[PDB]
Design a protein around this ligand. Structure first.
Ligand code: A1B1P
Ligand code: A1B1P
Lengths: 275, 273
């Protein structure tokens, strides 16, 4: 599986192509319209994914017996598995059955859960990028020691900015984030002026320090292990802050990426490297 | 909750109305917030139904059950509460509170499921699937006869519930009869209509059948997906009689024009015969 997670960090998965073009073998969508089909594909795998992560996060809970975990999986999974497998994602289903296979140990289950979560998280990301959220706008309107420095670069925007990430604030989270990335950049479609990208990792570490996003300042950085393994730049568990001096570019980086996921479907990639 | 469940079976919830009128999104549009509300309620519903089914299982403690709830629920509950369904959230919080009997939980779970499944039913009906429509194109001794009718289309048909095929499912659905609910169409599956029946059945479904094998007039149940009643013009339930199968074509036409376009409610009543 991991081979194709890596493949799909660079390339759009073929599954996410047939869905946008309407070439799914089943031709889903009653009365010759795959708009409904596409919608179900996007949402079913997004929520299926959030489920997978939480299943994982309980694989880390030891009060639950692994056998009880496997059973909660055989209960929750098959409906999402089969429908997605019949509406655009055949392999994900088979791999879900591989995850449901008896776990000789708790760690084996945990590893399968996290791999597969990230597989479907990459697919979620790509669908999120190509789903036409635009039809709506036309009609429906209204310790200083531990801070590590890194640099975030948006191409082909050619805009770079710097950021600190407070390892002290969220140690387990920051270490996992530091462990790893050039990934497609997209915009939140309901929250407002924020962008996020699907970081290539599966962190189940608890986050003691979270912030209410209305208190969050500009260029605030946040990682959501739940809605993807997303990294979020606000122009919630907190990760870091883009330095104030460069906050002046984030706003147009925003408008650009909003056009990316709302209007253009033109890829906008974001790289995080550590200074 | 049950108070609200009954009230909603006939009346549009306030929540679905304010979201579909955008009087609860990014850059002054609500269609994304709507797409999210619709899908998250639908899927929180499937999750709740599988969690009740879990609640029947005796291998899992009620404390392990409650912690699997305390983790999978909030991501859906709190979010939906921000966009459309606040009371859904507060009641989810309360379902989580420590239960001392499997039954107490299982009851709150089932009512909450069905509350959410009605919210889903109304969301599916009002949700706009017409937008992409222009952009994206191409023992007989055992069965118990009942009858179905659609108003204001004024069309009826007699059908038989195969108790022999699914005894548990048959009883669970009959005990709700008579009822009259919203009938909507199947937006992805094809030529099938369905309606959200007012029950939450944990009945086994020993017999199931390919929807491609399902004849015209095939009645199937959808306990896994909103405990719905599906007529095809899957767990098996019944069949409309051969001489009445012909009357199903135009009501499917009208109900597709109802769910896809008009939104003018189409109601179906099922009564025992
Ligand atoms: O405060 C908000 O509106 C939501 C914040 C964030 N925004 C995303 C977007 O805007 O696309 C969608 C999304 C978010 N959090 C979630 C939790 C569960 C399921 C979906 C989401
Ligand atoms: O569409 C299909 O081929 C599947 C059959 C059914 N059809 C529904 C429709 O058409 O609205 C959508 C739907 C179905 N089963 C599901 C399971 C999970 C999530 C959604 C669904």
């Amino acid at each position: 599986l991991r081979e194709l997670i890596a493949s799909f960090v660079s390339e759009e998965p073929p599954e996410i192509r047939r869905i946008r073009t309407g070439t799914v073998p089943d031709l889903p969508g009653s009365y010759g319209q795959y708009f409904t089909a596409w919608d179900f594909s996007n949402s079913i795998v997004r929520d299926y994914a959030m489920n997978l992560y939480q299943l994982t996060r309980l694989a880390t809970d030891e009060s639950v017996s692994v056998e009880n975990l496997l059973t909660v999986f055989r209960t929750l999974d098959p409906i999402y598995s089969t429908f997605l497998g019949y509406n655009g994602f055949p392999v994900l289903a088979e791999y879900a059955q591989r995850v449901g296979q008896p776990a000789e140990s708790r760690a084996e289950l945990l590893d399968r859960l996290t791999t597969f979560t990230e597989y479907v998280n990459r697919l979620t990301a790509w669908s999120h990028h190509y789903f036409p959220w635009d039809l709506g706008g036309e009609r429906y309107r209204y310790d200083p020691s531990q801070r590590i420095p890194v640099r975030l670069t948006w191409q082909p925007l050619g805009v770079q900015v710097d950021a600190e990430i407070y390892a002290d604030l969220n140690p387990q989270l920051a270490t996992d984030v530091l462990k790893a990335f050039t990934v497609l950049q997209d915009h939140a479609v309901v929250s407002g002026e924020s962008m996020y990208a699907w970081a290539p990792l599966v962190s189940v570490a608890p986050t003691p320090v979270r912030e209410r996003i209305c208190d969050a300042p500009v260029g605030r950085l946040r990682f959501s292990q739940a809605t993807g393994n997303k990294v979020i730049v606000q122009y919630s568990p907190v990760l870091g802050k883009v330095v104030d001096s460069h906050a002046d570019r984030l706003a147009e980086v925003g408008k650009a990426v909003w056009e990316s996921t709302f209007s253009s479907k033109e890829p906008v990639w974001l790289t995080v490297e550590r200074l």
